Amino acid sequence: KMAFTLADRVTEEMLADKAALVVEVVEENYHDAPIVGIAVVNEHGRFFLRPETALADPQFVAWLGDETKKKSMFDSKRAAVALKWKGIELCGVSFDLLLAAYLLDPAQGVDDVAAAAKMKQYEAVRPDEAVYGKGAKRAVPDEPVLAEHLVRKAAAIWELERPFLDELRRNEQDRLLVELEQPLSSILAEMEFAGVKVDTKRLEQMGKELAEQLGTVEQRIYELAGQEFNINSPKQLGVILFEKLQLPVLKKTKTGYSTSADVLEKLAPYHEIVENILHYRQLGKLQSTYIEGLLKVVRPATKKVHTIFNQALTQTGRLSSTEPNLQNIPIRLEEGRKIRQAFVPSESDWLIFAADYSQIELRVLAHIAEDDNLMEAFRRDLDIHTKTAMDIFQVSEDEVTPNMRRQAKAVNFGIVYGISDYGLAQNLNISRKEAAEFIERYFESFPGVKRYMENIVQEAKQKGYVTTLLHRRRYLPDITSRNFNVRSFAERMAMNTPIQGSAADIIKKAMIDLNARLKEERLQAHLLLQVHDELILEAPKEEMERLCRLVPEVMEQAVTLRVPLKVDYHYGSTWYDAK
DNA sequence: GCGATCAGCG
DNA sequence: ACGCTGATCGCA
Ligand SMILES: [Ca+2]
Numbered sequence: 001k002m003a004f005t006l007a008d009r010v011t012e013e014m015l016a017d018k019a020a021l022v023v024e025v026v027e028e029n030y031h032d033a034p035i036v037g038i039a040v041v042n043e044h045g046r047f048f049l050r051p052e053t054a055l056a057d058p059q060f061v062a063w064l065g066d067e068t069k070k071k072s073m074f075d076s077k078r079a080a081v082a083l084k085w086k087g088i089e090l091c092g093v094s095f096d097l098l099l100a101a102y103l104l105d106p107a108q109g110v111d112d113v114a115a116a117a118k119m120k121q122y123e124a125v126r127p128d129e130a131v132y133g134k135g136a137k138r139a140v141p142d143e144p145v146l147a148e149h150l151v152r153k154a155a156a157i158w159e160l161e162r163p164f165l166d167e168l169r170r171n172e173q174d175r176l177l178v179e180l181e182q183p184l185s186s187i188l189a190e191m192e193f194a195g196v197k198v199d200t201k202r203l204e205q206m207g208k209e210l211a212e213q214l215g216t217v218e219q220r221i222y223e224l225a226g227q228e229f230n231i232n233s234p235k236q237l238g239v240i241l242f243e244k245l246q247l248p249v250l251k252k253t254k255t256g257y258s259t260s261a262d263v264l265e266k267l268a269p270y271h272e273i274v275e276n277i278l279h280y281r282q283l284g285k286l287q288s289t290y291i292e293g294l295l296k297v298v299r300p301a302t303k304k305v306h307t308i309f310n311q312a313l314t315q316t317g318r319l320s321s322t323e324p325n326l327q328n329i330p331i332r333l334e335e336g337r338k339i340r341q342a343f344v345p346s347e348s349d350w351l352i353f354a355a356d357y358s359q360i361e362l363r364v365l366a367h368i369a370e371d372d373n374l375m376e377a378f379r380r381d382l383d384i385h386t387k388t389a390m391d392i393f394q395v396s397e398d399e400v401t402p403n404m405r406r407q408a409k410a411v412n413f414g415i416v417y418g419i420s421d422y423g424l425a426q427n428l429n430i431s432r433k434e435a436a437e438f439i440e441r442y443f444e445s446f447p448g449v450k451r452y453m454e455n456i457v458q459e460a461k462q463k464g465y466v467t468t469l470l471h472r473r474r475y476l477p478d479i480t481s482r483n484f485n486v487r488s489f490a491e492r493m494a495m496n497t498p499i500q501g502s503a504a505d506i507i508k509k510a511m512i513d514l515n516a517r518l519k520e521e522r523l524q525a526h527l528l529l530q531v532h533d534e535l536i537l538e539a540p541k542e543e544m545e546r547l548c549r550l551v552p553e554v555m556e557q558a559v560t561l562r563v564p565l566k567v568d569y570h571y572g573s574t575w576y577d578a579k
Numbered sequence: 580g581c582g583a584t585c586a587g588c589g
Numbered sequence: 590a591c592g593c594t595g596a597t598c599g600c601a
Contacts, residue, residue, distance in 0.1 A: 233599070234599075255600085258583085285585060285586065286586095289595095314593060316592080323595090325594085327594080328587035328594080361589050413592075417589090417592055419590075420591085485590090496589090500593065503588095503589070532587080
């Protein structure tokens with residue numbers, strides 16, 4: 001019902017200087033995954049190509065890599081990375097329908113061409129799930145069915161670029177797509193493909209010691225419980241703590257007793273066992289997520305792990321990282337932080353280099369709120385998290401432990417993002433009256449922040465959405481809900497999304513500027529990871545001293561705010577040492 | 580499959 | 590009853 005040429009070879013008219021291009025990769029994780037078919041729609045017609053012939057045709061390969069041959073796509077990073085695993089470079093991507101739809105409305109959850117097309121009342125294309133099936137029934141359909149599906153996705157991309165660009169422009173988001181999100185997409189593709197090398201010998205050695213410690217702690221739990229049970233069975237763990245041992249019930253879940261860490265540490269005065277349960281869980285998390293789980297995704301021949309950075313997922317414009325998630329490797333407890341010793345440079349005589357923004361969101365907040373006291377504080381390079389800890393624990397700066405500071409950091413963001421006296425009291429284990437008084441005092445010193453919180457909520461009610469500094473957008477229909485609890489969650493999104501999203505806009509622009517600078521200086525240094533406000537590179541040790549001056553300066557100059565940006569940086573032989 | 584839990588980011 | 594995530598596990 002859609003006409004296309006099922007082509008046995010590549011012809012010249014498939015190689016126009018503008019085209020919609022589909023390079024179909026069905027597996028969720030696209031690293032080293034099969035390319036099942038290719039579709040091209042342009043001024044001369046619609047074409048399906050089998051990958052075994054198109055990708056071995058030198059004229060098609062050259063066309064893929066020629067940046068002056070413009071291609072419109074859906075999820076170009078997926079295609080570019082899968083093409084890299086075939087040793088083929090993809091250049092010239094000038095429109096990405098996934099990123100366009102994510103910018104117009106991140107809450108759509110647009111995950112295939114059909115869902116984006118529906119935004120514009122275009123429905124001549126099927127959802128990928130209807131074509132490939134789900135779960136165990138998932139499969140590549142017969143070639144005629146496959147070819148028509150890829151042609152229809154291309155034809156839709158061809159038709160939808162113009163109406164998506166028009167709405168992007170009306171939102172002031174067209175340059176956010178063309179100059180920020182699409183250039184970043186190519187950079188993430190390089191980072192994912194390069195991967196991160198892993199010391200599997202050290203990881204496996206840590207894993208075997210972990211298992212020994214796990215058994216020990218597990219046994220002392222049974223002998224403290226008087227009996228044996230399944231320390232991961234909530235019904236059984238609840239029965240031990242809150243029936244057998246008769247500990248107080250501080251919190252319930254939808255299903256029964258709560259046993260979260262916060263609860264367990266309030267019960268620590270009552271019984272020895274709760275601290276052992278915490279230690280047991282922590283060691284168990286290292287074992288299953290960070291030892292076993294990481295070894296499961298190491299590519300064995302290279303010892304590299306290849307994450308996927310999802311760039312059209314979070315509602316605030318942050319990236320997220322999957323399989324493995326390399327944005328939540330342990331760091332806060334010393335036993336957990338040791339995991340980062342297994343992350344090593346991919347060449348001999350190279351080093352890991354990490355640079356991170358200092359108090360990024362509070363600096364964004366001071367700029368956006370134009371709070372005089374908060375702006376003066378960062379003009380002075382004060383550490384607000386340390387000063388707040390000094391205040392909270394009545395200590396001197398000399399005596400601020402990394403953990404009191406991590407705790408104070410949660411108070412600082414909690415207050416600006418809407419924590420209640422009740423919630424602050426539970427976090428600090430203080431009186432609820434004290435908690436309210438402290439919050440009131442905090443807004444006395446920063447009345448511009450209080451004003452900003454009120455104004456941004458009112459602006460979300462009037463406009464229906466909030467925006468970031470680079471015009472990322474988030475719709476908030478619930479902000480006018482008649483239900484109090486639904487409205488409240490929405491008001492706290494209005495307070496938080498412009499701040500966290502603007503901080504995401506800044507690190508994204510820093511990544512684009514850093515890549516261009518590394519290329520200008522003809523250095524081998526390249527990005528490996530982003531962790532929200534931190535960038536991790538590797539480079540020859542010969543380049544470290546230049547990177548100590550180049551990387552902070554690029555990051556600090558990515559944007560100009562009413563306060564300076566500050567970057568801390570470290571390097572060393574493993575990711576552990578780059579801190 | 581989902582909710583509780585915990586690892587990270589602010 | 591601060592916000593944004595992803596992986597694992599048991600299943601009241
Ligand atoms: Ca930081």
